[PDB]
């Protein structure tokens, strides 16, 4: 280590990490602690002033002491503690801390149901006519404040995805088969607590059709994530039900229709219709990853048995998402949504923000039944049922003095807006 020619002036022999010291009056000079200071070094001279841990804000995780009669207002619930730690750090000395997560019993839920409306989904529309109320009833078993929304999608409205015959532009399907014209994304219903409304509208929507098998749902997903007001998102847990019986188009497919300008990730609704499917490409998985994760969307993939392989795989690349097998006529959606919600709400995944060009980070997780985690697994805990507390040990290390200010980055469980501020202070001067 420091045993190899290292001596300089003040804030250098000091900023060479752990061992190295310089007493203020053989192998190497500025090298050790137990071999350097061993050979004539008084303990009043050395300059090794280090880093501290400052718990500036940590309201306790809400306990349920007051009982089953207290109905905790969503704003009072506290799942992550601390909330505003401050960390003084020196270049080489890990400054670890613990994070405590507890799963509260009840949180309001917005769920947006976004469905394939291509001809392949003919029978599925029929079954769904009563979904608005059955699902409300079921979802309330899990939440006091529930809202439901509905959105349909079919395809990009251009060569070669739909056929551009003037007659097929008006009926994409065959002779007797009535089909409404193709479209990209209809926002049928922004979020409401009125499930009858859901039912009233859903049975007014007509089935469409188009040409190529995969559909342009990624145009719709994006729009649902990025159009804040128009959809109705509140800062609560947000569920997007994406259900379909085909594969999906993504960036690079637009080229076939001369669409080569990448998706811009900005809202483009007018009359609750996406107006730019001609103009921007389908977004890449990575793009959706950014925007879902940026707008706290937890995604449920309700797809048919024959597209399970593709959607499991998609699930593996979308953090905080779930996939389930959807019946022929969508007969099992409701169970599915619940099955999906349970896994989502019983695992936690910790995501951090952007660090600086010489600052790393470690995660260690301590889950139920001694099941501990290291590395990338260090940010995961599953099998968390209501009331369970879990712990995370979080170390940060910097290499050398980067800025001379602070990087107030956040650590967050995917799905929740509950953050942990981690205000960093860098020590760059001698004493």
């Amino acid at each position, epitope marked *: 280590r420091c045993l190899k020619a290292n001596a300089k002036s003040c804030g250098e022999c000091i900023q060479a990490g752990p061992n190295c010291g310089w007493c203020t009056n053989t192998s190497a000079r500025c090298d050790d602690l137990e071999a350097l200071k061993k050979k004539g070094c008084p303990p009043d001279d050395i300059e090794n002033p280090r880093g501290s841990k400052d718990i500036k804000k940590n309201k306790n995780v809400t*306990n*349920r*002491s007051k*009982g*089953t*009669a*207290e*109905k*905790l*207002k969503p704003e009072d619930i506290h799942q992550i503690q601390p909330q505003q730690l401050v960390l003084r750090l020196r270049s080489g000395e890990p400054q670890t801390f613990t994070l405590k997560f507890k799963r509260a*019993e*009840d949180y309001p839920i917005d769920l947006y149901y976004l469905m394939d409306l291509s001809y392949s989904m003919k029978d599925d529309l029929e079954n769904v006519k009563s979904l608005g109320t059955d699902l409300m*009833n*079921e979802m*309330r*078993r*899990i*939440t*006091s*404040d529930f809202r439901i929304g509905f959105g349909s999608f079919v395809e990009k409205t251009v060569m070669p995805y739909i056929s551009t015959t003037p007659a097929k532009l008006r009926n994409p399907c065959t002779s007797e088969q009535n089909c409404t014209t193709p479209f990209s994304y209809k926002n049928v219903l922004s979020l409401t607590n009125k499930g009858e409304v859901f039912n009233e509208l859903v049975g007014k929507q007509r089935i469409s059709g188009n040409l190529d098998s995969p559909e342009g749902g990624f145009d719709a997903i994006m729009q649902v994530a990025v159009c804040g007001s128009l959809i109705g998102w509140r800062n609560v847990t947000r569920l997007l039900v994406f259900s379909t019986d085909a594969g999906f188009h993504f960036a690079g497919d637009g080229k076939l229709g001369g669409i080569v300008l990448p998706n811009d990730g900005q809202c483009h609704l007018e009359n609750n219709m996406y107006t730019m499917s001609h103009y921007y490409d389908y977004p890449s998985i990575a793009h959706l990853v950014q925007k879902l994760s940026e707008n706290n969307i937890q995604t449920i993939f309700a797809v048919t048995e024959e597209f399970q392989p593709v959607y499991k795989e998609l699930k593996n690349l979308i953090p905080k998402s779930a996939v389930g097998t959807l019946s022929a006529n969508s007969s099992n959606v409701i169970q599915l949504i619940i099955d999906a919600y349970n896994s989502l709400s019983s695992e936690v995944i910790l995501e951090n923000g952007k660090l600086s060009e010489g600052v790393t980070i470690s995660y260690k997780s301590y889950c139920k039944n001694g099941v501990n985690g290291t590395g990338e697994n260090g940010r995961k805990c599953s099998n968390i*049922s*209501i*009331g*369970d507390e879990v712990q995370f040990e979080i170390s940060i290390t910097s290499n050398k003095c980067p800025k001379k200010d602070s990087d107030s980055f956040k650590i967050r469980p995917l799905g929740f807006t509950e953050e942990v501020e981690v205000i960093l202070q860098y020590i760059c001067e001698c004493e």
Partner: antibody
Amino acid sequence: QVHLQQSGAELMKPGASVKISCKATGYTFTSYWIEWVKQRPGHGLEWLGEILPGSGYIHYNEKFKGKATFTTDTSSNTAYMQLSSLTSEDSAVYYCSRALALYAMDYWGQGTSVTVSS
Amino acid sequence: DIVMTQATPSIPVTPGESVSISCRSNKSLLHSNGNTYLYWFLQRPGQSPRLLIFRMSNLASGVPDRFSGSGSGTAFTLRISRVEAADVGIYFCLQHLEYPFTFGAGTKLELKR
């Protein structure tokens, strides 16, 4: 699979005391409150108290303060209720059920009758 | 504290007809939530109570659509659409808002003949 299995019928003498149990399977014991309800032949249903298997958080109906005492055993997923100074008033069927602030008493045990006769 | 009154102790009903069953309250069970914390239970004879309605209006799983729930802040009625032999029993309300929790005395539902 969600089931609450209560202890069999008990026969006691006026002034004794008794321990009724309720075992929970099919769900994670420490996330739901257990509820205790009393049913007298002619007095309908009566809420006694509740307890969260985690820590000793308890909430009592005052009428029963120092009549009913609640405990849980996490290692065996069993909740317990003790009746003491038994009289004819205490002679009833006793139910345990399940609750959260949001969803109360979905599931119930089969019942336990405590008859108190010399 | 909160008292629950189920004025009618029993109602005879011809198998097929529809019945309202009412429950009054000392205090209003409407929370700031917008949730009214009132529950409804049915007890078949020689059996433990089963849940029916879980926040003034909401149905428990397995409880058929024949059972509906509604009410003000203080006046709640449960309606049943097509009374069967299976729906014979005692119907209890309960207030899940304040300690101690309170049931009314039930209403016994039996068939007319």
